[PDB]
């Protein structure tokens, strides 16, 4: 039984300003969640709210701690489905929903003498994450790309979306100095339908292959996502357009995308599990991503990825871009590789 | 880790012959599955093969005991997702796939010190099953209906499909002497689309309400199921047409039915979990059914239902129709009520 739920503000600084389409961050403000059971067991989760994607604000999350306590204290974690249904009402605070739900499983796994990944199926023992190259000058982008490659990452995520011509130039240059690596391009909704297609064609013509082309158009433009998918040689993914299990069910029905970038910060554990099942029951493929989680937060996704083994690609580099005094995940990080203890 | 698997035939005789559209059974021949772990823990499951629904034959299941053994031994039950994936290759032996997957969770939960239902979410502490009135003369159907009503069952499942006129009469007669009960009518594919619609409209005209109208047409007639759904007042369910998670995705995409009768014997635990997620992500509603399971076999569905709490109706009565020496389920039953220990 849950006897207490604590929310705490935790600030983390980025090695350097992180720039993506329409956004620049030098700080990541998260809300840490701790659940305490009467037995003494403590489960931990982390919420990394996004105003841009989920409409959330950290101050708002912190303001509802008491309501969260009233919602689930007294409930036994072995009846976790009840906790999941209740926390699903927090659809306006998706990142907190995710933290609370994971902390619940974290606590439950401890009581059962096991780990969250095994509770979810323990399908994989290891997964590899890519690392992101934020928007900057072509020169700096190429520089960072080389450094990432030299660090051992064989999947490089390239941000674009604000300048088609320069974006194409950047991808081409990066490709030259990182032969052997796969590439993921993320426009974070910056392109129009035709621009998105032009980008893919231009890069394809140079002999460059893109593993995943993330959310090229605006979030409401489902038809646009489909248009790019059907007129672009690379796998197209929905990120901002895919927050709930209902959004995914809709994207599948419309045959809108080849991929969906699942993020616990958008869907929580409950919807994430539904999306995994939906993808495995259709032609949809998945990749798991992140927002601004610290190591404790990425831990939630690592266990989810390892347990379900449902992803072709993993973009869980958030903690790698933040200055963090001490590692706090229940997993092992070895370069791009991640395993469980 | 699993060090061995054993399959063995188990026969159960019916209190009386069970008659449904195009099939009469006097006995249920099941295949019990036992998995042994290096720790000494033993997991149990039961396969109730259906030749009519799954194309399975008891002899064939027993014949591949060695193959199954080779497939799963050496795998830790904490990595159950791996076992699920491997056993998914037994799509030609669905009932066996179910028995093995459940035996796995049964063994896993024992090691973790909990029960299968809690492992699956522990959503509910109690569920209620209906009881079936097989095909017979109107007079005998009415007699069995009264008896079932007297036993405390408030949801009565009525078999029909071989005689439209007599079927209507049977349902109308049963309704008069069981006021207060809800009814589920199952045609087992016996009607043409128009006959199915006429059956429903006639019952409706007499002021009778049908909770679930199961598989009124042939299994391949998806548009027929949809036709009945759009032209009759009661919720229409797919049973024989819904075996795999892929069948369900198709049924949802085509808006063919209101309900899907999930059966572990058709889907196994893996697909059943996917179907539950697909339903919760759409307008689809679910009921859980059975084939010819004995108490040990029904236990698999009871835990699935209690843990997921995903069903509106429960048709888990096969063990109540079979003569069984000793009860062998890990659950408690009081009339239509079923709870866990
Ligand atoms: Mg993205
Ligand atoms: Mg049926």
């Amino acid at each position: 039984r849950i006897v207490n739920v604590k929310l705490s503000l935790k600030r983390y600084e980025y090695e350097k300003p992180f720039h993506i389409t329409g956004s620049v961050s030098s700080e990541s403000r998260n809300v840490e969640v701790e659940i305490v059971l009467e037995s003494g067991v403590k489960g931990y989760g982390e919420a990394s709210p996004s105003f841009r994607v989920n409409g959330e604000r950290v101050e708002a999350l912190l303001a509802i701690e008491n309501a969260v306590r009233e919602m689930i204290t007294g409930i036994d974690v072995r009846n976790y489905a009840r906790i999941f249904e209740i926390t699903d009402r927090l659809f306006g605070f998706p990142s907190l929903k995710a933290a609370v739900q994971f902390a619940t499983l974290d606590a439950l796994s401890q009581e059962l003498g096991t780990q969250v990944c095994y509770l979810l199926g323990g399908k994989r023992d290891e997964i590899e994450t890519d690392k992101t190259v934020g928007i900057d000058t072509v020169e700096n982008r190429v520089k960072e790309a080389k450094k990432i490659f030299e660090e051992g990452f064989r999947v490089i995520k390239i941000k674009v979306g604000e300048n088609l011509k320069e974006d194409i130039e950047a991808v081409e240059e990066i490709a030259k100095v990182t032969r052997g690596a796969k590439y993921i391009v993320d426009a974070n909704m910056g392109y129009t339908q035709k621009e998105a297609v032009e980008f893919a064609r231009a890069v394809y013509q140079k002999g460059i292959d893109i593993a995943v082309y993330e959310q090229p158009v605006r979030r409401e433009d489902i038809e646009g996502l489909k248009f790019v998918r059907f007129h672009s040689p690379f796998p197209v993914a929905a990120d901002e357009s895919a927050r709930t299990k209902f959004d995914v069910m809709r994207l599948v029905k419309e045959e809108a995308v080849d991929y969906v970038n699942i993020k616990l910060m958008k869907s929580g554990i409950s919807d994430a599990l539904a999306i995994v099942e939906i993808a495995e029951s259709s032609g949809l493929k998945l990749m798991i991503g992140c927002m601004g989680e610290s190591s404790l937060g990425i831990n939630q996704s690592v266990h989810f990825a390892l347990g379900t083994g449902a992803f072709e690609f993993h973009d869980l580099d958030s903690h790698l871009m933040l200055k963090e005094e001490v590692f706090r995940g229940k997993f092992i990080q070895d370069g791009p590789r991640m395993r469980v203890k």
Side-chain angles (χ1 to χ4, degrees), chain A:
Chain A
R1 271 175 182 173
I2 295 177
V3 296
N4 188 29
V5 178
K6 314 181 63 176
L7 276 57
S8 307
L9 171 64
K10 291 284 200 299
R11 294 162 183 275
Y12 298 98
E13 177 181 59
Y14 282 97
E15 311 285 45
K16 63 181 180 64
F18 188 47
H19 183 190
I20 65 179
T21 300
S23 173
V24 187
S25 309
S26 57
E27 196 190 27
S28 176
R29 324 255 301 311
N30 302 330
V31 178
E32 187 175 304
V33 176
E34 172 186 351
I35 292 186
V36 189
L37 273 32
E38 64 192 324
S39 71
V41 168
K42 305 180 176 185
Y44 294 85
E46 180 187 59
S48 187
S50 170
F51 183 59
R52 184 183 56 94
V53 185
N54 302 317
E56 301 168 295
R57 295 197 72 73
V58 55
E59 287 68 28
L61 270 65
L62 296 165
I64 69 168
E65 168 177 290
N66 196 248
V68 175
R69 280 178 177 174
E70 286 174 349
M71 290 172 91
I72 65 179
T73 67
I75 304 180
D76 200 303
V77 291
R78 72 177 189 174
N79 293 299
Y80 72 85
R82 292 175 199 167
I83 292 172
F84 278 21
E85 198 192 313
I86 291 175
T87 56
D88 273 345
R89 289 165 197 154
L90 294 171
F91 66 88
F93 304 80
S95 66
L96 181 57
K97 169 189 167 188
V100 170
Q101 290 183 347
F102 185 84
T104 291
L105 295 184
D106 184 34
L108 170 60
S109 60
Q110 291 179 63
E111 300 213 303
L112 296 173
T114 190
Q115 298 239 67
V116 178
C117 56
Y118 299 127
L119 230 45
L120 299 175
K123 196 159 190 174
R124 294 176 62 174
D125 292 314
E126 182 182 304
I127 56 170
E128 295 203 6
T129 175
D130 56 33
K131 190 162 174 180
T132 305
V133 172
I135 296 175
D136 205 324
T137 66
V138 178
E139 195 184 79
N140 293 315
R141 283 156 131 171
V142 173
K143 159 52 187 173
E144 178 157 60
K146 293 182 184 178
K147 180 183 175 65
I148 292 178
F149 192 72
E150 177 181 55
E151 297 186 302
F153 294 92
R154 285 299 165 282
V155 180
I156 303 179
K157 180 167 179 173
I158 305 174
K159 290 289 178 174
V160 309
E162 283 178 354
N163 190 305
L164 181 61
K165 190 179 306 306
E166 177 178 343
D167 291 328
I168 295 174
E169 184 52 41
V171 173
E172 283 164 350
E173 290 305 307
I174 285 178
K176 291 178 184 175
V177 300
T178 54
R179 291 176 59 267
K182 310 292 281 299
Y183 311 109
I184 288 180
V185 175
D186 185 347
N188 285 116
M189 313 179 283
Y191 300 150
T192 63
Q193 290 178 32
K194 297 305 174 71
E195 297 186 323
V197 176
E198 176 45 46
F199 173 82
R201 291 177 66 192
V203 172
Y204 174 84
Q205 286 299 152
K206 295 284 293 185
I208 301 174
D209 185 61
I210 305 299
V212 183
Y213 188 16
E214 273 183 85
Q215 193 77 43
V217 301
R218 292 175 61 183
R219 89 186 73 200
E220 298 284 12
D221 195 15
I222 305 308
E223 308 183 314
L225 277 173
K226 185 178 186 173
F227 190 86
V228 179
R229 181 196 179 197
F230 279 70
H231 300 281
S232 141
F234 309 125
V236 175
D239 184 337
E240 287 87 340
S241 293
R243 298 169 56 199
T244 68
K245 54 192 180 182
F246 295 106
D247 296 326
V248 178
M249 198 60 238
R250 174 177 282 92
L251 291 164
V252 164
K253 290 176 177 171
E254 316 271 51
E255 298 175 50
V257 300
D258 305 292
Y259 272 87
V260 154
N261 178 338
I262 301 186
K263 288 179 193 179
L264 303 177
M265 290 309 104
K266 281 184 298 171
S267 314
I269 298 296
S270 51
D271 285 59
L273 293 171
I275 294 175
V276 160
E277 291 305 342
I278 293 174
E280 301 179 337
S281 301
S282 59
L284 187 66
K285 282 187 291 293
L286 308 170
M287 75 175 267
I288 182 171
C290 60
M291 305 283 219
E293 294 97 299
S294 59
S295 61
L296 177 71
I298 254 61
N299 177 71
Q300 304 167 303
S301 291
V302 169
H303 273 270
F304 194 81
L306 286 172
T308 66
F311 312 96
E312 304 303 314
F313 291 101
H314 312 74
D315 176 37
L316 308 172
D317 60 347
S318 181
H319 65 305
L320 304 179
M321 311 175 89
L322 296 172
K323 298 180 179 179
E324 195 172 357
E325 283 191 357
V326 63
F327 184 76
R328 307 177 65 213
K330 280 190 173 70
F331 69 92
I332 297 175
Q333 179 97 200
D334 176 46
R337 295 176 295 294
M338 308 161 115
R339 276 172 283 91
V340 69
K341 310 176 180 176

